[PDB]
Each structure stands twice: as C-alpha cells, then as structure tokens.
Symmetry: C2
Subunit: 217 residues, 2 copies
C-alpha cells in the first residue's frame, strides 16, 4: 500500500511507509515533512524509492519546494530515498557518522553532512541533536521548536511496544543514557514521534529508558 | 540475514517452533507452529514459514529418531503452509481443511495430499482435535486442541495480549470474528495454555482479549 501523509500540527505532517510481509501483514515506518511558507523539509525519507517519489509529488503538487532532507540514521527505513532526492538535485543531509556508515556499506550518500553534535536546518525550523548510541551508534533526534514536537526516530519506542525491537546494531547499555541526554535538553515536548508506531507524549522517553534498562539486565 | 528456526519445549511431548523473517529497516518478525509427539511419532501443526526452515524442523525430528507422521495447516496463508511442497516431496502426509486446500489450489499454490471435510477431525488417534469455529482472521482458519497437554493452538485467529489490534485484516471477516471465538469457548475445552500464530503463549484469557478486539473493530 502507498505512502500515507497526515497532518499532526500546523506545518507538520507525518509520512508513513508500508511493507507487506507475506504470512504476517503490514509493517510501517514514519518520518515527517515540515512546511514553512513555500518550503518543505523532509525528516527521514520514506522506506522506498517509489514512496519517496510520492512524497515529493505530495509537496510539489501543493506548491512547495523541497529544500532538504535529513536522515536520522543509516538504516534503509531512514535513507532509502537519498539516491532519488540526489537525482532531483534536492540537498540531502545526515551526520558525518551516518554518511560514513552509508559509504562504508556502499550505499548512496548524502550531499551534505554536519560534524558537530548539533545542527539546524531551515533557519531554526529543525534543530538536530546527537544524544549518543542507542538503537544504532549514529541515531540523532530532531526538535521542532514551533510545534514542540520531538522526532525521536528509531531511538525511541512507542507505547505499542514492550521491547526495544531490532538490536543487531544497538548499544543497549548506552541507550538509557542517550535518552537521558535528550531529557537534559529540557525541550518543552508536546508530542514525540517514533520511527515505528504511533505518536505519543513526552512519556515515550520514560518508556524507552525503562525498556533499555531492563534489556541491559 | 536469515535467523534460523527455533524449537522450544512447552509441555511434555509438545514443542513450539518459531520462524523469523528479517525485514530490512524494521527488524525480525515471527510465526509459531507446534510439534506434538506421541511415542516416537511426530505431528506438525503448521509448517515453518519457509522451505529452509521446514527442512530444519524435519532434521530436528529425524535427528531425534522421530517419524514425522503428518502436518496440518490451520489456514492457507504462507506462514502456515510454506513447507507443504517440501513435505510432499518426501511423502510425508500433509493435511488441511477442504476449504483451505481449495483456496490453495485456486491460488496455484502447492496443495496438501490430504484434507478433511467436516467441522471436526482428529489426527494421531485423539492426539490432535481440529475444529473449524467460523471465519475470523481468514475465512478458513481452524484451531487444534491437544487433550493430553490441555493446549489450544488458536493460530492466527487468536491475539496475544502483546497486541493492541487484530493485525492483518485484508483476508478477515471482522463481523464474524468474535462469534467464532465464542464458538471455541462453547466447546468448553479445559484450556491451560493458548498458543497464537504470532506472539507469546498465554492463558485462556487470550480468547477474551480476542473477543474484545474483534468487537471493537466491528463497532
Ligand atoms: Zn534503524
Ligand atoms: Zn527504523
Ligand atoms: Zn494468516
Ligand atoms: Zn499468521
């Protein structure tokens, strides 16, 4: 089934990609599109090239210019559309580490990267922060100061889940600390968006800390 | 990155087998069946999710000196039937309901060599009791009751407490699902444990949870 895009705040839309697993059912993956006058910014590509093309059409059919994407770690559900965005001359961004992990895997790389633990896109529309290893070594989060939404990506676990999920690339013993570094920013969080599953409140941070500590033991 | 079949004992003469698929950008998803033993005779309730995992389950059994007498698949979906072709190639009897068999045929998938026509059927001389309670997860889903161990294999018609919804409903009859679960209840089996098609083994409470979720999606 195709990409779904639904409004979750003024100028903020959740995009969800799906894969249909024979014998199991549909699984899904979230990112955001953030709108500012006539400019759009994508936080995580959709999960496939085809879905990324649908996301671009969504924006441009509405008269927006897609200014940039940012991918919040190197896995395919965050980065599948980088190649397409690059082919359309849309700036793609990741952290330096994420870029280097993609390059090391022989995957298309973003055309731009940032070196520090913090970076901003869209002149403060989106504030990126690397809190430490968790779901992966390179996972970053995005804070949207206007809408008070934290896109936690795959580092955070929605309440629908009673486990950490895939941990093949995880640093389980650092994960709780990395969430605590997010808490220490004292963002006035109204909503937290996960990489997989339903939008929640700031309590998703506590839920994740607890899943992390349990797994550590 | 294939993670192999896992087999774990859950009662005397009853083993849970779990197959896994590793979905890039997501992680591992899984699917359960059973192996039920009677002396050195083994019966498979649902095949593993792939040919290779079915091979591994066959090797599990034969390495332990068991003869695999038959498999029974509890509906037509791939997670229940993937191994039918391979079992057939080794002359191991494969069973489904008549409806499941015909759905497979219609889809041009490998068909079982055996099928039962009634709403009830037994394998192994009272070892496994099969019952069709009605449509739910699919039009053809059946359940298996194990008298000796007091285990109900509910397969994908039942929802573990871990799940907040009915799951995939592309092939479902949401309106009939609660009723079908009530039909199971009406059997008055002395259930000690209920095993789902996807997720953790639980207690007879799984049935009430499923009725709840069915009613809610209906409403
Ligand atoms: Zn990931
Ligand atoms: Zn993810
Ligand atoms: Zn099914
Ligand atoms: Zn199933």
């Amino acid at each position: 089934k195709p990409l779904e895009v639904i409004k979750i705040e003024d100028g903020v839309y959740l995009h969800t990609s799906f894969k249909n697993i024979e014998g199991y059912g549909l699984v899904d993956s979230n990112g955001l599109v953030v709108l500012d006058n006539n400019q759009a910014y994508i936080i995580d590509t959709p999960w496939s090239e085809e879905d990324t093309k649908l996301l671009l059409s969504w924006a441009t059919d509405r008269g927006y210019q897609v200014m940039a994407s940012i991918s919040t770690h190197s896995h395919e559900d965050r980065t599948a559309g980088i190649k397409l965005l690059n082919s359309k001359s849309i700036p793609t961004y990741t952290s330096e580490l994420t870029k280097k992990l993609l390059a090391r895997e022989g995957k298309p790389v973003p055309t731009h990267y940032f070196k520090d633990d913090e970076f901003t896109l869209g002149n403060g529309l989106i504030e990126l922060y690397y809190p430490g290893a968790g779901h992966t070594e390179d996972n970053i989060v995005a804070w949207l100061p206007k809408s008070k939404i934290l896109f936690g990506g795959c580092l955070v676990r929605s309440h629908e889940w009673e486990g950490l999920g895939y941990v093949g690339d995880a640093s389980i013993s650092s994960w709780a600390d990395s969430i605590k570094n997010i808490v220490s920013k004292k963002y006035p969080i109204q909503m937290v968006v996960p990489g997989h599953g339903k939008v929640g409140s700031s309590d998703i941070l506590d839920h994740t800390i607890d899943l992390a500590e349990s797994a550590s033991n």
